Amino acid sequence: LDFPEYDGVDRVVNVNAKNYKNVFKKYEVLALLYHEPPEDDKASQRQFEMDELILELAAQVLEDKGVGFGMVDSEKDAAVAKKLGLTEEDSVYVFKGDEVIEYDGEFSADTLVEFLLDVLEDPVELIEGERELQAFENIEDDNKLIGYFKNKDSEHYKAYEDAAEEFHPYIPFFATFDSKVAKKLTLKLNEIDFYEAFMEEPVTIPDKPNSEEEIVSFVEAHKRSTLRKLKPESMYETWEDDLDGIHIVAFAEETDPDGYEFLETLKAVAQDNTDNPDLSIIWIDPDDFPLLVPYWEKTFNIDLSAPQIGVVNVTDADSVWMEMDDEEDLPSAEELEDWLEDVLEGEINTED
Amino acid sequence: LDFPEYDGVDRVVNVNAKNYKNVFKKYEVLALLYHEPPEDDKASQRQFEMDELILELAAQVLEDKGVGFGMVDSEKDAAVAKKLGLTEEDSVYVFKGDEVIEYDGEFSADTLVEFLLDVLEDPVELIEGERELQAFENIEDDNKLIGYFKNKDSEHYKAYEDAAEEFHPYIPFFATFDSKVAKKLTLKLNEIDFYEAFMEEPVTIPDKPNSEEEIVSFVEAHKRSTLRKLKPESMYETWEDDLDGIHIVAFAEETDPDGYEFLETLKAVAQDNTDNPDLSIIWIDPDDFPLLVPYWEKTFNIDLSAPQIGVVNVTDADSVWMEMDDEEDLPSAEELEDWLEDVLEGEINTED
Ligand SMILES: *[C@@H]1O[C@H](CO)[C@@H](O[C@@H]2O[C@H](CO)[C@@H](O)[C@H](O)[C@H]2NC(C)=O)[C@H](O)[C@H]1NC(C)=O
Ligand SMILES: *[C@@H]1O[C@H](CO)[C@@H](O[C@@H]2O[C@H](CO)[C@@H](O)[C@H](O)[C@H]2NC(C)=O)[C@H](O)[C@H]1NC(C)=O
Ligand SMILES: [Ca+2]
Ligand SMILES: [Ca+2]
Ligand SMILES: [Ca+2]
Ligand SMILES: [Ca+2]
Ligand SMILES: [Ca+2]
Ligand SMILES: [Ca+2]
Ligand SMILES: [Ca+2]
Ligand SMILES: [Ca+2]
Ligand SMILES: [Ca+2]
Ligand SMILES: [Ca+2]
Ligand SMILES: [Ca+2]
Ligand SMILES: [Ca+2]
Ligand SMILES: [Ca+2]
Ligand SMILES: [Ca+2]
Ligand SMILES: [Ca+2]
Ligand SMILES: [Ca+2]
Ligand SMILES: [Ca+2]
Ligand SMILES: [Ca+2]
Ligand SMILES: [Ca+2]
Ligand SMILES: [Ca+2]
Ligand SMILES: [Ca+2]
Ligand SMILES: [Ca+2]
Ligand SMILES: [Ca+2]
Ligand SMILES: [Ca+2]
Ligand SMILES: [Ca+2]
Ligand SMILES: [Ca+2]
């Protein structure tokens, strides 16, 4: 019942033009850190050595599951990086089957291993019976899809499974062969419903039966939800996807009664304005990022033991926050909408 | 939006007979690692240096919040340890006000900081209105209390608040002054209901109005729930609290449809047998301990992508597991009860 400690065995090496084919052959799943060359100062060297140690621990933990880790220097190994498609420094590229999955989240052994374990699972989860259907309906912090097919041999299910591989493990794909589940979901045979994160009502993919290409293109177009949750596994991907250099950031601790009350108002506002293409709200639950809470309180000058919502300038990390006297001074849906209007029409921005 | 890195400033020192009064005076909240003296070999020294570095990072993150960290050598500093009440090696003792809170969970900067942030919050959360009441009802993985009082100046509320301090932050204490909330909860004025983890029906504390002593003694007697969840913040406390050297361990991924279905059966069985004093089940959700999943799969010889339940021999880590062909071969409540009966009456044990 005790956490693993690094055993000193060198399992993570630099992946270069000489060895890369043998590395790909040695491992069923290969995760490659694409990194800039470390600077020569002692601090950057120490930081680089500590980064490699993180991969060594993950490689030890996942050795018996066919996972390997490597490192690609973006300058020294620029040619191999180009052939393999490694373009974003500090991203980890995970090779499973015919897909290349970009990891752009917290660089920690625990978060990396959890991600790899999700990668190793199958990309479609079946739903049969009432309890499994309830488990499906409880998912709201992720975009999700569900389709109804004849059986696992259906050409349309196989297209659906192939599409699921493209977005694995970020967007869970569900399938049912149970006409009673499908009827409850209002899914006609071979229809696919896309449930945007935190939305109650789905969007049916048009022109069924759907091909892999029709599903992929649909998901790409609905990928960005009106309300999306910051998660360690994807925090930098989410944070780097700003809209004109602005994030609306809502802090709410889901388990706290005041956070829940505010989060419920936020969800209701997102649902009523889900079609506004200029509206994108990031919900950060502070309990998921304890090491950042003091930094956020200092940088934004807010008390994160209470709900908050603001506009964040990503370049200078400048901000403006809705004025709430305390945790009990929460805005109504109408007040929150109007405040959002002000941020969108520019009435409320960091540059004033 | 970037994790803090240790800045090299020495904030964590050994706490000994010469300095301990000044350390206690320097910090509003003080967390002391009570540790055995490190061995002289290079590995134990490196491990000891890395452990101190964890505290340094936590101390940096929480410096502006009045938190300090120290280390007490159980041999060199045995006398100070005795005066301060430090008895369990590898535990962190947190001093807040008149209380001493034992931390016996994952030794990591993120988990430590999250715990300290919970310690710093007030020990009673108020409930007013329908949404806050819903937030209270959503809590099930913890024991919880809720009491109805006249107002914050009530002598009975103050006794309740004093009792909450004893168990902070492990057992959340809730209070309401709202007669409409209280009526919905069936709480008479100054009554306190204790909701055991995962139970639907509460137990009312007898002989109200209740004193601090009556509440504390009650909570101590109901502290161990029939079903309890392994959490990083308390994993070793929970794991060290075995019943005759045996844990019943249930693996279920709450978000997975098969895990949910099994977890729902487990909850139903726990509720129907909540008064069996010999029954204690530990639920481990694998998504909370990714770095341990491969180790558990190897040690117990089970596939943790599916639900599992077994009997664990803590000395030799030996085990026996309910035989489930796959994720869809889940037991009914009756089958699970009978299996539990077998483990309790000895019919199923690791020694066979
Ligand atoms: C976000 O912050 C950046 C940096 O503070 C802003 O950039 C400045 O914008 C003003 C007005 O356009 C210029 O006068 C400055 O010269 C800019 N400085 C730099 C370094 O570019 C940016 O305008 C802000 N954007 C939003 C949407 O708030
Ligand atoms: C749990 O495991 C320990 C260690 O394997 C068991 O201890 C052994 O018990 C048998 C039978 O009582 C003795 O013959 C051995 O000599 C014991 N060995 C040691 C080292 O003590 C223990 O009995 C097991 N307990 C349960 C409840 O399964
Ligand atoms: Ca190496
Ligand atoms: Ca493809
Ligand atoms: Ca990036
Ligand atoms: Ca962790
Ligand atoms: Ca439909
Ligand atoms: Ca078509
Ligand atoms: Ca990216
Ligand atoms: Ca609160
Ligand atoms: Ca409140
Ligand atoms: Ca939308
Ligand atoms: Ca917390
Ligand atoms: Ca957490
Ligand atoms: Ca409130
Ligand atoms: Ca030090
Ligand atoms: Ca006391
Ligand atoms: Ca211990
Ligand atoms: Ca973490
Ligand atoms: Ca009652
Ligand atoms: Ca009394
Ligand atoms: Ca303990
Ligand atoms: Ca499953
Ligand atoms: Ca299933
Ligand atoms: Ca019980
Ligand atoms: Ca997972
Ligand atoms: Ca997790
Ligand atoms: Ca099932």
- Give me the CATH number covering residue B203: 3.40.30.10
Q: Do B257 and A114 touch (CB under 8 A)?
A: no
Residue closest to B337 by CA, chosen among B286, B278, B259, B270? B270
Residues A230 and A352 in one domain: yes
Amino acid at B241: D
User: In sequence order, what DSSP letters do the residues of B62-84 get, joined into one string?
Assistant: TGGGTEEEEEEETTTTHHHHHHH
- Half-sphere exposure (Cβ direction) of A319: Cα atoms closer than 13 Å: 22
C-alpha A143: how far from chain center: 10
**Cα(B317) to centroid of ligand 2, in Å?**
11
Which listed ligand is nearest to B188 at the C-alpha?
20
Task: Look at residue B5 and give its three-state secondary structure.
Answer: coil
Resolution limit in angstroms?
2.6
A232 known member of a binding site: no
Task: Look at residue A47 and give its three-state secondary structure.
Answer: helix
For the sheet containing B227-229, what is the strand order? B227-229, B281-284, B246-251, B308-313, B318-321
- Domain's final residue, options B72, B98, B123: B123
Residues A216 and A273 in one domain: no
Taking the C-alpha atoms of residue B12 and residue B165, their distance in angstroms, rounded to an integer, is: 26
Residues A134 and A91 in one domain: no
Per the CB < 8 A criterion, the answer to whether B59 and B66 are in contact is no
- Domain's final residue, options A168, A190, A225: A225
Residues B73 and B135 in one domain: no
Taking the C-alpha atoms of residue B248 and residue B341, their distance in angstroms, rounded to an integer, is: 12
Would the CA dihedral through B185, B187, B189, B195 be positive or negative? negative
Residues B145 and B160 in one domain: yes
Residues A318 and A241 in one domain: yes
Which pair of tokens denotes residue B255? 């978000």
Q: How was this structure determined?
A: X-ray
**Cα(B80) to centroid of ligand 16, in Å?**
19
Q: Which residues in A lie closer than 8 A to residue B258 (C-beta atoms)?
A: 132
Strand partners, A47: none
**CA B222 to each of CA B165, B171, B277, B294: distance values in angstroms, whole numbers, following the listed order:** 17, 11, 10, 34
Per the CB < 8 A criterion, the answer to whether A231 and A242 are in contact is no
Residues B23 and B108 in one domain: yes
Which pair of tokens denotes residue A114? 């959890």
Q: Which residues in A lie closer than 8 A to residue B110 (C-beta atoms)?
A: 290-291
**Cα(A306) to centroid of ligand 13, in Å?**
12
Taking the C-alpha atoms of residue A191 and residue B68, their distance in angstroms, rounded to an integer, is: 58
Taking the C-alpha atoms of residue A126 and residue A22, their distance in angstroms, rounded to an integer, is: 36
Nearest CA in chain A to B317: A1
Q: Which residues in A lie closer than 8 A to residue B113 (C-beta atoms)?
A: 290-291, 293
Residues B273 and B235 in one domain: yes
Which of the listed residues B244, B311, B313 should we mutate to test ligand 2's pocket, taking the one with most ligand atoms within 8 A of CB? B313
Q: Do A132 and B258 touch (CB under 8 A)?
A: yes
Q: Which domain holds residue A312?
A: 226-352
Residues B115 and B128 in one domain: no
Q: Do B131 and A257 touch (CB under 8 A)?
A: yes
Residues A53 and A132 in one domain: no
Taking the C-alpha atoms of residue B118 and residue A253, their distance in angstroms, rounded to an integer, is: 12
A240 known member of a binding site: yes
Which pair of tokens denotes residue B107? 């030794």
| Residues 6 or more apart in contact with residue B169 via CB below 8 angstroms | B101, B115, B118, B119, B121, B123
Strand partners, B313: B246, B318
List of E strands, B127-261: 144-148, 173-176, 192-195, 203-204, 227-229, 246-251
C-alpha A276: how far from chain center: 22
Task: Look at residue A125 and give its three-state secondary structure.
Answer: strand
**CA B181 to each of CA A80, A331, B51, B136, B189: distance values in angstroms, whole numbers, following the listed order:** 65, 22, 47, 11, 11
Q: How many domains does chain B have?
A: 3
Q: Which residues in A lie closer than 8 A to residue B64 (C-beta atoms)?
A: 294, 298
Which pair of tokens denotes residue A210? 């759907």
**CA B306 to each of CA A127, B16, B314: distance values in angstroms, whole numbers, following the listed order:** 15, 50, 23
Taking the C-alpha atoms of residue A134 and residue B255, their distance in angstroms, rounded to an integer, is: 10
Residue with tokens 């009350």: A261
Taking the C-alpha atoms of residue A127 and residue A178, their distance in angstroms, rounded to an integer, is: 8
Per the CB < 8 A criterion, the answer to whether B51 and B107 are in contact is yes
- Domain's final residue, options B190, B225, B260: B225
Q: How far is A289 from chain B (nearest CA, A)?
A: 8
Residues B230 and B335 in one domain: yes
Residues B85 and B173 in one domain: no
- Number of Cβ atoms within 10 Å of the Cβ of B286: 21
